[PDB]
Design an enzyme around this catalytic site. Sequence first.
Site, PDB file in Angstrom:
ATOM      1  N   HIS A  62     105.919   7.264  30.844  1.00 46.14           N
ATOM      2  CA  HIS A  62     105.522   6.383  31.982  1.00 46.14           C
ATOM      3  C   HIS A  62     106.032   6.919  33.296  1.00 46.14           C
ATOM      4  O   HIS A  62     105.505   6.636  34.409  1.00 46.14           O
ATOM      5  CB  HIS A  62     105.818   4.923  31.778  1.00 46.14           C
ATOM      6  CG  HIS A  62     107.149   4.430  31.461  1.00 46.14           C
ATOM      7  ND1 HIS A  62     108.163   4.068  32.317  1.00 46.14           N
ATOM      8  CD2 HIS A  62     107.642   4.152  30.221  1.00 46.14           C
ATOM      9  CE1 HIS A  62     109.203   3.626  31.649  1.00 46.14           C
ATOM     10  NE2 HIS A  62     108.912   3.687  30.374  1.00 46.14           N
ATOM     11  N   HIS A  92     114.580   7.160  38.463  1.00 48.52           N
ATOM     12  CA  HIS A  92     113.217   7.550  38.150  1.00 48.52           C
ATOM     13  C   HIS A  92     112.394   7.206  39.413  1.00 48.52           C
ATOM     14  O   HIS A  92     112.964   6.570  40.298  1.00 48.52           O
ATOM     15  CB  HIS A  92     112.507   6.946  36.930  1.00 48.52           C
ATOM     16  CG  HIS A  92     112.571   5.409  37.047  1.00 48.52           C
ATOM     17  ND1 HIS A  92     113.661   4.704  36.687  1.00 48.52           N
ATOM     18  CD2 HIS A  92     111.685   4.548  37.653  1.00 48.52           C
ATOM     19  CE1 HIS A  92     113.504   3.426  36.975  1.00 48.52           C
ATOM     20  NE2 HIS A  92     112.332   3.333  37.506  1.00 48.52           N
ATOM     21  N   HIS A  94     108.220   6.396  41.012  1.00 53.98           N
ATOM     22  CA  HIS A  94     106.850   5.837  40.868  1.00 53.98           C
ATOM     23  C   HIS A  94     106.091   6.590  41.986  1.00 53.98           C
ATOM     24  O   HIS A  94     106.667   6.654  43.078  1.00 53.98           O
ATOM     25  CB  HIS A  94     106.740   4.323  41.203  1.00 53.98           C
ATOM     26  CG  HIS A  94     107.558   3.528  40.192  1.00 53.98           C
ATOM     27  ND1 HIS A  94     107.084   3.117  38.985  1.00 53.98           N
ATOM     28  CD2 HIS A  94     108.835   3.228  40.203  1.00 53.98           C
ATOM     29  CE1 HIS A  94     108.024   2.565  38.324  1.00 53.98           C
ATOM     30  NE2 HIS A  94     109.132   2.586  39.024  1.00 53.98           N
ATOM     31  N   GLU A 104     106.016   0.890  45.078  1.00 52.89           N
ATOM     32  CA  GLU A 104     105.883  -0.416  44.381  1.00 52.89           C
ATOM     33  C   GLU A 104     106.072  -1.513  45.436  1.00 52.89           C
ATOM     34  O   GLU A 104     105.118  -2.236  45.730  1.00 52.89           O
ATOM     35  CB  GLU A 104     106.925  -0.479  43.296  1.00 52.89           C
ATOM     36  CG  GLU A 104     106.380   0.437  42.132  1.00 52.89           C
ATOM     37  CD  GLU A 104     106.940   0.035  40.833  1.00 52.89           C
ATOM     38  OE1 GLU A 104     108.074  -0.247  40.627  1.00 52.89           O
ATOM     39  OE2 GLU A 104     105.991   0.002  40.002  1.00 52.89           O
ATOM     40  N   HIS A 117     113.905   4.663  42.192  1.00 49.18           N
ATOM     41  CA  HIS A 117     114.748   3.578  41.702  1.00 49.18           C
ATOM     42  C   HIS A 117     116.003   4.080  41.011  1.00 49.18           C
ATOM     43  O   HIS A 117     115.839   4.791  39.984  1.00 49.18           O
ATOM     44  CB  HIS A 117     113.978   2.658  40.670  1.00 49.18           C
ATOM     45  CG  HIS A 117     112.814   1.932  41.346  1.00 49.18           C
ATOM     46  ND1 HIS A 117     111.722   1.471  40.660  1.00 49.18           N
ATOM     47  CD2 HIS A 117     112.573   1.577  42.609  1.00 49.18           C
ATOM     48  CE1 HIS A 117     110.817   0.899  41.477  1.00 49.18           C
ATOM     49  NE2 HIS A 117     111.318   0.939  42.644  1.00 49.18           N
ATOM     50  N   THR A 196     110.164  -3.423  36.969  1.00 49.07           N
ATOM     51  CA  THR A 196     108.784  -3.339  37.295  1.00 49.07           C
ATOM     52  C   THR A 196     107.920  -2.807  36.185  1.00 49.07           C
ATOM     53  O   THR A 196     106.708  -2.681  36.385  1.00 49.07           O
ATOM     54  CB  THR A 196     108.563  -2.663  38.674  1.00 49.07           C
ATOM     55  OG1 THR A 196     108.763  -1.236  38.473  1.00 49.07           O
ATOM     56  CG2 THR A 196     109.329  -3.261  39.866  1.00 49.07           C
TER      57      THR A 196
HETATM   58 ZN   LIG Z   1     111.135   1.797  38.717  1.00 52.57          ZN
END
Ligand SMILES: [Zn+2]
EC number: 4.2.1.1
Length: 258
Positions: A62, A92, A94, A104, A117, A196
């Site tokens: 992911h 990590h 996004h 996000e 994050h 999230t």
């Molecule tokens: Zn995250």
Amino acid sequence: HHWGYGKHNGPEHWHKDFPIAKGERQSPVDIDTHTAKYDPSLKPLSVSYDQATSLRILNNGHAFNVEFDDSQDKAVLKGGPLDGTYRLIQFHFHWGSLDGQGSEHTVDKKKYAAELHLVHWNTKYGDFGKAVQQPDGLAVLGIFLKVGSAKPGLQKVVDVLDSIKTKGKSADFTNFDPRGLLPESLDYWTYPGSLTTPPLLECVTWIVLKEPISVSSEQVLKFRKLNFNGEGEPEELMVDNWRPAQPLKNRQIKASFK
Ligand SMILES: [Zn+2]
Ligand SMILES: [Hg+2]
């Protein structure tokens, strides 16, 4: 089937397996700067990352996580809106398929190219798995990335991506210093929210820094070469692994600055 970011298993479907998706304190949210309240009782954040011990980098299907040794108070976050000490466990990102999307959280509806994050867990709870059963179990530091200049400190991460291209792959990743990922200013917004990604647990105190870090186009480009799929499976590029903004509901966003 299992959750992801595709048309058939994307954020709009998560609620079917994780009903908390439609909860009262879901993240991320849009940060309305004119409605966020300055709170003078908020203390400055204390980031103590000089003793940080990175261990490994992993493609979990992911995103990619850089994991840290959290067996002792090596890399911790305190102060701000927090009570107690929180230990860094992993970081990590996004990101998007294009530069105009990937974050996000949004600021006045503005989307950044990516969002970092840094996940921390409340030491009073003894371990990560216990922290996620508490309303003040986690603290996540969120940092926006905009495309501009290269970020020297991110280059070591960029360089190892080729080796963890597919889901399930990992690589030793020692001696990485997370201090090279911080903006100059530690001014932030804070609100109570959740992870999230599934399980979407509502245990997070979110600390979103006001100042974004710049990354180069080429740095971002290498993120977009990762794969959601496992080796020997048809290729699905790892892009747009972000959850859209959720309703604020009964929550107030506080500002550490004015
Ligand atoms: Zn995250
Ligand atoms: Hg929780």
